[PDB]
């Protein structure tokens, strides 16, 4: 009967997500906290050759004209299946030990970990969709894969004005992609925060034309998610969706309305961000395992990944 | 609650496939090759450009890379209608009913592996596909939810070449190089999934690839002993090595049927009905699954088949 708190910390690349989280998990005992970092040791080397120099050098030359459209989406699109790799592993075995939502005692174990798998699955391709480098049927593959919801899934996004954000970055410095970037993960906040007053994007389709994911109104369609597949590829003589496409919106709208997502503010000292970042941890979601050696076994998993690939 | 009974028709194309299943009222709907999402819908003639890039890699005309990042993306188009289906067809899926009728019957030309494992492994066999591409969409395949019944094939391979050649679809090359990889890849399939239900841990066995189931080199898991995959002290890195682990658990659950198509289409037919028999039901989980996953068969077959 133990309880696990599991802890994404996501949102655009960077807002200072790493040292927050190492520094967290330095003020905690090594035995009831446990980072999976970034998989460094699989992007670099292992899963491929150097994915994060192609992906911004395929932008660039996309950019300046020097390859198709078509070119720079299968480039793209075969990145990020390989990027997303790590994640949903990760996911899919630790899948089988998570239980129900017991509330938000300390848990007996604290997970933290650098990104969840929508960030490869659905943000960054919707970033790249938005950058011209990736068709939205290639995006909407992606969000039909993403593995289902677990339990207490704590998604922690950033929060840090632009300019304070572009002047992190200054030490490709695509300043386009970072406004892209930053657009998807507001649009994810609007649209969990959608989903969870009720929102249905069916319902509300026709209101298209032309962020605070746990609290205040409802957002209008229009700032969430689903405003992205607008897009003439998608739409059928009649002028709707094909239904195909619309079951991957479903599938969208399924796997966001049960996260629980929290707003980190990174307009602040290193220390500072991770006092924040430990008091919106204490009205997180925990869960119970479903054995009672789970806590030992996702415990070795998590270290083993993190000294594979980050390390 | 009502009971349904999944069937998926696969293994390598042009057995008769497609043919077979056509040929075998409302208590029976069948989801098709959603060919008009591949050539048009998804992406402008995606199995021309797939046998393209291959033909072009055979001519030495792209390097082994090109073909690669073509090829995996190719694969995601080809595969996302399946993975849409089952992710919306999912939580309709109830548990087993076990050992009468079933209220609907539902017939897929192919189960979400042909896309997330199968054709990417072949792939990998004929060059065009890292190893890693192919265990990043093994890290993908949906769950093994009950009742998930599958279908694959037996055919001499002079008979299938013969059926393959008269039935080639729109931008495909006779390719026997990519038959044999294909045909490979499914008899390894089949082994795998006996082996797993008879107790093979690959783990326990991946020794022996160095040196009652089959041998765990007739299986899938030799695949993945590909240098890429591997550190320089020959160990699997455990990324992969934790891929297989789901491989083994989504592979395992399955149940494997075997349709001899060294017959005529008739006879076909009839050996497939015959095999529904042992075949697993489940119950649906809510009163209006019936009608809903209905709706979903027949809108999936008016949009995207042929």
Same mark, same amino acid.
């Given at each position: 009967?133990?309880?696990?708190?599991?802890?994404?910390?996501?949102?655009?690349?960077?807002?200072?997500?790493?040292?927050?989280?190492?520094?967290?998990?330095?003020?905690?005992?090594?035995?009831?906290?446990?980072?999976?970092?970034?998989?460094?040791?699989?992007?670099? @080397? &292992? #899963? /491929?050759?150097?994915?994060?120099?192609? $992906?911004?050098?395929?932008?660039? %030359? +996309? *950019?300046?004209?020097?390859?198709?459209?078509?070119?720079?989406?299968?480039?793209?699109?075969?990145?990020?299946?390989?990027?997303?790799?790590?994640?949903?592993?990760?996911?899919?075995?630790?899948?089988?030990?998570?239980?129900?939502?017991?509330?938000?005692?300390?848990?007996?174990?604290?997970?933290?970990?650098?990104?969840?798998?929508?960030?490869?699955?659905?943000?960054?391709?919707?970033?790249?969709?938005?950058?011209?480098?990736?068709?939205?049927?290639?995006?909407?593959?992606?969000?039909?894969?993403?593995?289902?919801?677990?339990?207490?899934?704590?998604? @922690? &996004? #950033? /929060?840090?004005?632009?300019?304070?954000? $572009?002047?992190?970055?200054?030490? %490709? +410095? *695509?300043?386009?992609?970072?406004?892209?970037?930053?657009?998807?993960?507001?649009?994810?906040?609007?649209?969990?925060?959608?989903?969870?007053?009720?929102?249905?994007?069916?319902?509300?389709?026709?209101?298209?034309?032309?962020?605070?994911?746990?609290?205040?109104?409802?957002?209008?369609?229009?700032?969430?998610?689903?405003?992205?597949?607008?897009?003439?590829?998608?739409?059928?003589?009649?002028?709707?969706?094909?239904?195909?496409?619309?079951?991957?919106?479903?599938?969208?709208?399924?796997?966001?309305?049960?996260?629980?997502?929290?707003?980190?503010?990174?307009?602040?000292?290193?220390?500072?961000?991770?006092?924040?970042?430990?008091?919106?941890?204490?009205?997180?979601?925990?869960?119970?395992?479903?054995?009672?050696?789970?806590?030992?076994?996702?415990?070795?998993?998590?270290?083993?990944?993190?000294?594979?690939?980050?390390?």
């Amino acid at each position: 009967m133990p309880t696990l708190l599991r802890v994404y910390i996501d949102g655009p690349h960077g807002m200072g997500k790493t040292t927050t989280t190492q520094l967290l998990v330095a003020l905690g005992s090594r035995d009831d906290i446990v980072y999976v970092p970034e998989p460094m040791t699989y992007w670099r @080397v &292992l #899963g /491929a050759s150097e994915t994060i120099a192609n $992906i911004y050098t395929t932008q660039h %030359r +996309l *950019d300046q004209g020097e390859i198709s459209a078509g070119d720079a989406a299968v480039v793209m699109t075969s990145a990020q299946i390989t990027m997303g790799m790590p994640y949903a592993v990760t996911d899919a075995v630790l899948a089988p030990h998570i239980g129900g939502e017991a509330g938000s005692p300390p848990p007996a174990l604290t997970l933290i970990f650098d990104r969840h798998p929508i960030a490869a699955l659905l943000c960054y391709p919707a970033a790249r969709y938005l950058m011209g480098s990736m068709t939205p049927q290639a995006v909407l593959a992606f969000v039909a894969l993403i593995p289902p919801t677990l339990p207490g899934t704590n998604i @922690v &996004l #950033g /929060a840090l004005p632009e300019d304070r954000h $572009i002047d992190r970055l200054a030490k %490709r +410095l *695509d300043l386009a992609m970072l406004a892209a970037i930053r657009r998807v993960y507001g649009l994810l906040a609007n649209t969990v925060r959608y989903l969870q007053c009720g929102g249905s994007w069916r319902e509300d389709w026709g209101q298209l034309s032309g962020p605070q994911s746990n609290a205040g109104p409802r957002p209008h369609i229009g700032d969430t998610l689903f405003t992205l597949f607008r897009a003439p590829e998608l739409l059928a003589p009649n002028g709707d969706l094909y239904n195909v496409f619309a079951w991957a919106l479903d599938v969208l709208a399924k796997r966001l309305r049960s996260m629980h997502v929290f707003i980190l503010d990174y307009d602040q000292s290193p220390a500072g961000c991770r006092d924040a970042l430990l008091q919106l941890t204490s009205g997180m979601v925990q869960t119970h395992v479903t054995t009672p050696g789970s806590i030992p076994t996702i415990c070795d998993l998590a270290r083993t990944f993190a000294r594979e690939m980050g390390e």
